[PDB]
């Protein structure tokens, strides 16, 4: 067990990446709404930070 560089990508980065894609679908369907876009921003922020943490 225990987290590795791999599990970070397979168990964190990929899932978050998937969530962003799905929220993107909600945006494309419902223009009005600041929440869905804020969510994508927060998740993108999350992944960029996790990826850097894992690559260093």
């Amino acid at each position: 067990t225990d987290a590795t560089l791999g599990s970070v990508y397979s168990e964190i980065i990929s899932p978050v990446k998937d969530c962003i894609l799905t929220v993107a679908k909600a945006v494309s369907f419902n223009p009005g709404g600041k929440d869905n876009t804020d969510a994508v921003e927060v998740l993108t922020e999350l992944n960029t930070k996790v990826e850097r943490a894992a690559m260093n």
Partner: protein, 48 residues
């Protein structure tokens, strides 16, 4: 594979995201929020 400073950096990122995201603005985003919490719990299970 992961150092201690990496693990805490990642956990901190998960926490920040869970705390500030609009996870209580809609039922849809609530689920997103729950998934994020599920991801962190899985990570915590491994490093602990």
């Amino acid at each position: 594979q992961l150092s201690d400073e990496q693990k805490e950096t990642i956990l901190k990122a998960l926490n920040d995201a869970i705390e500030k995201g609009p996870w209580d603005k809609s039922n849809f985003l609530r689920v997103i929020g729950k998934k994020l919490i599920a991801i962190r719990d899985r990570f915590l299970k491994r490093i602990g």
